[PDB]
Paper text:
Coxsackievirus A10 (CVA10), belonging to the human type-A Enterovirus (HEV-A) subgroup, used to be associated mainly with herpangina, but in recent years has been increasingly reported to co-circulate with other members of the genus such as enterovirus 71 (EV71), CVA16 and CVA6 causing hand, foot, and mouth disease (HFMD) outbreaks in Asia, Europe, and North America2,3. Like most members of the picornavirus family, HEV-As comprise 60 copies of viral proteins VP1, VP2, VP3, and VP4 arranged in pseudo T = 3 symmetry, encasing a positive-sense single-stranded RNA genome. Intriguingly, although CVA10 shares ~69% amino-acid sequence identity with EV71 and CVA16, it utilizes a different receptor, KREMEN1, for entry into host cells, suggesting CVA10 might differ in its mode of entry into host cells or perhaps even in its local structural features that are involved in receptor recognition. Here, we provide models for CVA10 mature virus, empty- and A-particles at atomic resolution, and establish details of the events covering a staged exit of the VP1 N-terminus and ordered structural reorganizations of VP1 GH, VP2 A2B and VP3 GH loops and alterations of viral genome structure as well as genome–capsid interactions during the uncoating.
Compared to mature viruses, the CVA10 empty- and A-particles are markedly expanded with a ~5% increase in capsid radius. In empty particles, there are 60 extra small channels at the base of the canyon (off-axis channels), which are plugged by VP1 and VP2 in A-particle. As expected, both expanded particles lack visible VP4 and harbor neither an hydrophobic pocket nor pocket factor in VP1 due to the movements of the polypeptide backbone in residues 229–233 at the end of the GH loop and the start of strand H, and the conformational changes of the Met229 and Phe232 side chains. Interestingly, only parts of VP1 GH loop (residues 212–223) are flexible in A-particle. Unexpectedly, the A2B loop (residues 38–50) of VP2 located between the twofold axis and the base of the canyon refolds itself from an extended loop observed in the mature virus to a short helix in the A-particle, but is flexible in the empty particle. The most striking differences occur at the VP1 N-terminus (residues 1–71), which lies at the inner surface of the capsid in the mature virus, and is disordered in the empty particle, but traverses the capsid terminating on the external surface at residue 62 in the A-particle (the first 61 residues of VP1 might be disordered). In the empty particle, refolding of the VP1 GH loop and the VP3 GH loop and partial disorder of these two loops as well as the VP2 A2B loop result in the formation of off-axis channels. It is quite likely that the rearrangements of the VP3 GH and VP2 A2B loops, together with increased volume via particle expansion, facilitate the egress of the VP1 N-terminus, obstructing the off-axis channels in A-particle, which might be triggered by receptor-attachment.
Numbering used by the authors:
A (entry chain A), E (entry chain A): 63 to 211, 224 to 297
B (entry chain B): 14 to 136, 143 to 250
C (entry chain C), D (entry chain C): 1 to 174, 183 to 235
F (entry chain C): 1 to 48
The structure:
C-alpha cells in the first residue's frame, strides 16, 4: 500500500452497523445446466443456503439469531460465454413444496411456485425473497434434535431450465448473488478460530487444534 | 444473609453485585394466541425454589464442567414433573455458583452462560449423542476447554453474561438469565435453551497439607415459569 | 409516451448498488417479530468487550497456558516479566481478542484502548509490578528506570487485585509495515512475597478492549479464512 | 428526453408480479353488477362450516356407512368405541371435511377446532358416552380411567342429543412427520340402554370445523389432483 | 422439510382472501404454430377456457358464480428455442365473431378484432381482457339446456400468426398465462372428490367411486 | 408500466455530459475536511 501517516480524527461510524456489515451482494453458489436431451438432466436446483461458502458463514456464526430479507441475482453464461436469445425459467419453490423431478415435469407449471421468464441476452434477473421462517428468526445454532432434512431454516429452492419444446444443446452456469436486507441480529457469539470440517455442524479436528495467536521467540521480547 | 424460598434456605452474603444476562429481567410472556385460548400456568408455591446440585470437585488436573437447562432440572422435585408433560414451556433462572476454599488456595474460574450452546464432534460426522446434549443433573466435563468443544476460542467467551471467581477476591457469582428464544414457548424436553459453564482458567494450586480438591456448588432458582397443555 | 434517453450505466449489475428487486411472493406476511434480548446494532459494541490477550504465545505452551502470564518468587526485583505490542490488527497476541478479529474486516482503525491485568494468587501473597506503556516510535524500555520515566502504573496486588491501563491513542492507516507499534511491558518493582506453606507461583491474566473513541473503516475480508 | 438507466429485472416476466396490462378492448363497459346472495370474501368462511368426519374409514364400509360411528347394546361399559387423530391436513378421516380439503392448499396452519357428536337413536334409548381429547405428544388413552384424567365430556344422549368438544390449539408447521397429532376417543360410560321393541342399535355422526382463531399460510397445490 | 416447532401465533389473514386465492398468473394452454406454406395451416386459434387443466378447474368449481377480469401473457419460443426477429400477431376475437379460416384470410385485417404486433425477440406481450358475459357473472354450473356451442361463458379467442408475405419455415409454440384480477365469487360449492371424466360436464364413473378418506386397520385404533 | 419512447441520444456516451454515475462504494464516508490555507477558486486569481 501507501499513504503512511497518523489519523487524528474519528472515522465514519456508518460502516460498522450490522445492516451495512451484511449488505453488499455476493456470490452464494454456482450451478451448471447442460440441456442434452435424454443423456443429461437438463435443469438445475439450488437449495438456498448461506453457509455454503466460508467467508459469509463465519459472519453469520458471529450471532445466534438473525432476521432479514434476501435479494437474488442470476448471472448466467454459456461455456465460452457468448450469449444467444434463449428463454429461461427461474422457478422459486417455497418451503414445504415438491421440487422438479425432470425438465418437462408437471411441477414447472405449478402456479404457487413463482417464476420468471427472461432471455439469456437480457440483463440478469433480480428477485426479492421475504423472511420465510415459522419462528421469529433464523438460527444456525440449535441445541437439541432438529432432524427433519437439508440445511436448517429452509428458505426455499430455485430451479432453472430452458424454455423450448425440443432440447437445445446448450451448456449453462448460473451464478447466484444474494444481498441481505433489513438485517437484525441477536445474541452475539465468538468468532471461530478452527477450520470447518463439514457443513451444518460445528465439528473440529481434536488431534490438530490451531492456536488463536501465532508464535514468538520469547515472552520478554516484543519485536 | 439467608435466602428463604419455600422450604429451602441457603446461607449466602448480601451483595447488590450480580450479572443480569444481556440486561433484562425474566418476564412472563406477552399474551399470545394459543395461551389466550388456554391460560398458562404460573406456579410458584413449591415449584419455584432453590435447587442445589451435587457439588463438583475441582482438582489440579481438571478441565471444567457444563450444564444444560431446562434439562438439568428435568428430573427434580416438582419442576421436573411440570417439565414432563406440559408441551409448552417458558422460564428464566437465578444461578448462584459457590466455592468453598481457604485463603491458602489460589486459582480462578470463568463462569458463563451460553445460549444455544452446542457441543460438537471431535472426529467424519460423529453426531454427539444425548450425553453431550443432555448430560443430566450431574453435567459433563470438557475435553478441549481452549476451544470450548465448540471450535471457538475461550478467550472470546466474555461476550457472554459472565463473572469471574478469583479465589483471591470473591468465592461466589450470581447470574440472572431471562428466557431467550426465537419463539415465545418451546419444548423443554427436546430443546435445551442455554447452558452454564465453569472452566478453571488458572489451575488450582496449593502447598502440601492443604485439601487437594475444592468443591463447587450450584444453586438454581427458576423465575417466572410458565407451563402449557398437559401431555 | 414520455420521451427518454438511455444513458451510460444502462443494463449493468453493480453489486453494491442499492435498488429495488421485485417481490417474488407478494401477499405473504412473515412471522411477526417478538422481543429477543441482546440485540446488536453495531460491531463497535463487540469491540468494547474486554477479552483475553494471549500474551504467552510460544512453541512451549499448548492449552489454556497461552492465556497466562507467569509470575514467580524466583525472579529478582527490577527485572522484566512480559512485553507485547499494542496492535489489535496485526499478528501477535491481539489475535485472540474480538478487537483483533474485527479489525481483520477493516483497512483503517483508530481510537483508544484499555488493557486490564488480573492477578490470581493466594490471598496472602503480596508484591508490586510496574505496568508501563512506551508510545510508538520507540523501542521497548531497556530497564525499569526508563520504563518509570514514561506512562506507567505501580500496581500492588496485595492491595488491589486488578489494574487497567488506558492507551491514549493508536492508529493503523494502511507491503511496508506502516504501524510503528508501541509496547506494554511488565516489571518487577518488588519480588513476589509469599508466606509459609503457600505456592509461591501465580499467574497474571491479560485482557484488552476498545474505548468508545475507537472506529473502523474500509471493509474487507479476513486473512484467516482461506477458501 | 429524460435520462434514465435500465436496471436488473428489465425485460423479465415474473408470474406473481402485480403490474398493469394494456386493455385490449377499451370503451367496453361490462354488464353492471347486481346483488347475488351468498358472496364469499375468505376461505376461512368455508373452514368454519362444520362438515361430516368420516370416522369409519375401513375396507369393510362402502356407502354412506363410512360416515357413521356404530353404537350397539352388545358392548360393555368402560370400553372404547372409536378413536381418530385431530389432523385436518393429514391422510385420515379429516379428508372429507372442508377444513381437510382447504388445508391441502396451504403449508402451515394453526388455531382451534370444534368436533360435534350427534346421536341418532330412538327417542326412548338412553346412555352415557365419554368424549375425550388427549393432547399431542401422548398416545391415545389405554382405558377409561386415564381418559377421564384429562380433557373430556360426559355426554348422556338420553338428555342431550348433541355435544361439542373444542380442541384448544393445534398446529402443523412443515419427509419427517412434524405433526405429533393428539386424539379424540369415544368410551362407553354406561351400556346403551333400550326399552322393549326398539332396535337396540344406533349410529353417531361426527362433524368438524375451525374456530375463528384458525389461520393458514404459504399457498400450494393439492396432492389429490394428479395432472 | 425442516423447522419443526409449534406456532403459538395467528398467521397472516391476507393469503386466504378469494382475490389472492385466484391470483398468481399461470399456464392456461399450449398451442403450436408451424408455418409450412401450403402443407401446414400456419396459424393457431386458442379458445379462452379456464377448465382446460384440472388444478384451477377444481378451484373454480368451489363456487357457483364468479366475476373477474383476465390478464394474458404469451411466452413463445421456437423448437430448440433460439429466437430470431420475426413479427407476430395476436388477434383477439370477441364473443360472437368469426375466427380466421386461414393464414392470409380477411379476418386478420378486421379492425374490431384488436391485435398486437410484437417481434419474437421482444419480451412477452401482455393484454387485459374485461368481464365479457351478458349476465352479471360466469357460471360453470347451469341446470337446464344451454346448448349453443364450445365451453360455457364464451370469453373470446386468440389467434396467432407470423407477419410476412412469404411463409417462413418456423415452428412455434405459444404458452398462454392467465392471471385473474378483481375476482368476486358467490354461492360456494363442495370440492370434487372424484376424477373428472370429460370437460364441460361433471361426469363420474359410477362403477368405480373413490372414497374421500383413506383406510385404516380398525376404528378403535388411531395410529 | 408507464409508456415511454426512446429518443435520439439513447445509449450514447458524451464526454462533457453532466449526469449521475452509480456510487460503487456506498456507506463510505470520506475523511472530514479541515481548513487548509490558500484555497483557489479561479484561474483568474493566478493571472493577476
Amino acid at each position: 500500500m501507501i499513504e503512511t501517516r497518523c489519523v487524528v480524527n474519528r472515522n465514519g461510524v456508518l460502516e460498522t452497523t450490522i445492516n451495512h456489515f451484511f449488505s453488499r451482494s455476493g456470490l452464494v453458489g454456482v450451478v451448471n445446466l447442460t440441456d442434452g436431451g435424454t443423456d443429461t438432466t437438463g435443469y438445475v436446483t439450488w437449495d438456498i443456503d448461506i453457509m455454503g461458502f466460508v467467508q459469509l458463514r463465519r459472519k453469520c456464526e458471529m450471532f445466534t439469531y438473525m432476521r432479514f430479507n434476501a435479494e437474488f441475482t442470476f448471472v448466467t453464461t454459456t461455456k465460452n460465454g457468448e450469449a444467444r436469445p434463449y428463454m429461461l425459467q427461474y422457478m422459486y419453490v417455497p418451503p414445504g413444496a415438491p421440487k422438479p423431478t425432470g425438465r418437462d415435469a408437471f411441477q414447472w407449471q405449478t402456479a404457487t411456485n413463482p417464476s420468471v421468464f427472461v432471455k439469456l441476452t437480457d440483463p440478469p434477473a433480480q428477485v426479492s425473497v421475504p423472511f420465510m421462517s415459522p419462528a421469529s428468526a433464523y438460527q444456525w445454532f440449535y441445541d437439541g434434535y432438529p432432524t427433519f432434512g437439508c440445511p436448517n431454516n429452509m428458505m426455499g429452492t430455485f430451479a432453472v431450465r430452458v424454455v423450448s419444446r425440443e432440447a437445445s444443446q446448450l451448456k449453462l452456469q448460473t451464478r447466484v448473488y444474494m444481498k441481505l436486507k433489513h438485517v437484525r441480529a441477536w445474541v452475539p457469539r465468538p468468532i471461530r478460530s478452527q477450520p470447518y470440517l463439514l457443513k451444518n455442524f460445528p465439528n473440529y479436528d481434536s488431534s490438530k487444534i490451531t492456536n488463536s495467536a501465532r508464535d514468538r521467540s520469547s515472552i520478554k521480547q516484543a519485536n | 444473609a439467608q435466602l428463604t424460598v419455600g422450604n429451602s434456605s441457603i446461607t449466602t452474603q448480601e451483595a447488590a453485585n450480580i450479572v443480569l444476562a444481556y440486561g433484562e429481567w425474566p418476564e412472563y410472556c406477552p399474551d399470545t394466541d394459543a395461551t389466550a385460548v388456554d391460560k398458562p400456568t404460573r406456579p410458584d408455591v413449591s415449584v419455584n425454589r432453590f435447587y442445589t446440585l451435587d457439588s463438583k470437585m475441582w482438582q489440579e488436573n481438571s478441565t471444567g464442567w457444563y450444564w444444560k437447562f431446562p434439562d438439568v432440572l428435568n428430573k427434580t422435585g416438582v419442576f421436573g414433573q411440570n417439565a414432563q408433560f406440559h408441551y409448552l414451556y417458558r422460564s428464566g433462572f437465578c444461578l448462584h455458583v459457590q466455592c468453598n476454599a481457604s485463603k491458602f488456595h489460589q486459582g480462578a474460574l470463568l463462569v458463563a452462560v451460553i445460549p444455544e450452546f452446542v457441543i460438537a464432534g471431535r472426529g467424519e460426522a460423529p453426531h454427539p449423542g444425548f450425553t453431550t446434549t443432555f448430560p443430566g443433573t450431574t453435567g459433563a466435563t470438557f475435553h478441549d476447554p481452549y476451544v470450548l468443544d465448540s471450535g471457538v476460542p475461550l478467550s472470546q467467551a466474555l461476550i457472554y453474561p459472565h463473572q469471574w471467581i478469583n479465589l483471591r477476591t470473591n468465592n461466589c457469582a450470581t447470574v440472572i438469565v431471562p428466557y431467550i428464544n426465537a419463539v415465545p414457548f418451546d419444548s423443554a424436553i427436546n430443546h435445551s435453551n442455554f447452558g452454564l459453564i465453569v472452566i478453571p482458567v488458572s489451575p488450582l494450586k496449593y502447598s502440601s497439607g492443604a485439601t487437594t480438591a475444592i468443591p463447587i456448588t450450584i444453586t438454581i432458582a427458576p423465575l417466572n415459569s410458565e407451563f402449557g397443555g398437559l401431555r | 409516451g414520455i420521451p427518454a434517453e438511455l444513458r451510460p450505466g444502462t443494463n449493468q449489475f453493480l453489486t453494491t448498488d442499492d435498488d429495488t428487486a421485485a417481490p417474488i411472493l407478494p401477499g405473504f406476511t412473515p412471522t411477526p417479530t417478538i422481543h429477543i434480548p441482546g440485540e446488536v446494532h453495531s460491531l463497535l459494541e463487540l469491540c468494547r468487550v474486554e477479552t483475553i490477550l494471549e500474551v504467552n504465545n510460544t512453541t512451549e505452551a499448548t492449552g489454556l497456558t497461552r492465556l497466562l502470564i507467569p509470575v514467580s518468587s524466583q525472579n529478582k526485583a527490577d527485572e522484566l516479566c512480559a512485553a507485547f505490542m499494542v496492535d489489535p490488527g496485526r499478528i501477535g497476541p491481539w489475535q485472540s481478542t474480538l478487537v483483533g478479529q474485527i479489525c481483520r474486516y477493516y483497512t483503517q482503525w483508530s481510537g483508544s484502548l484499555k488493557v486490564t491485568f488480573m492477578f490470581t494468587g493466594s490471598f496472602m501473597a503480596t508484591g508490586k509490578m510496574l505496568v508501563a506503556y512506551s508510545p510508538p516510535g520507540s523501542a521497548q524500555p531497556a530497564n525499569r528506570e526508563t520504563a518509570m520515566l514514561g506512562t506507567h502504573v505501580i500496581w500492588d496486588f496485595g492491595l488491589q487485585s486488578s489494574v487497567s491501563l488506558v492507551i491514549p491513542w493508536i492508529s493503523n492507516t494502511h507491503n511496508y509495515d506502516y504501524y510503528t507499534a508501541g509496547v506494554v511491558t511488565l516489571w518487577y518493582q518488588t519480588n513476589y512475597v509469599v508466606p509459609p506453606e503457600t505456592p509461591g507461583e501465580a499467574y497474571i491474566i491479560a485482557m484488552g478492549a476498545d474505548l468508545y473513541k475507537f472506529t473502523l473503516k474500509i471493509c474487507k475480508d479476513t486473512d484467516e479464512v482461506t477458501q
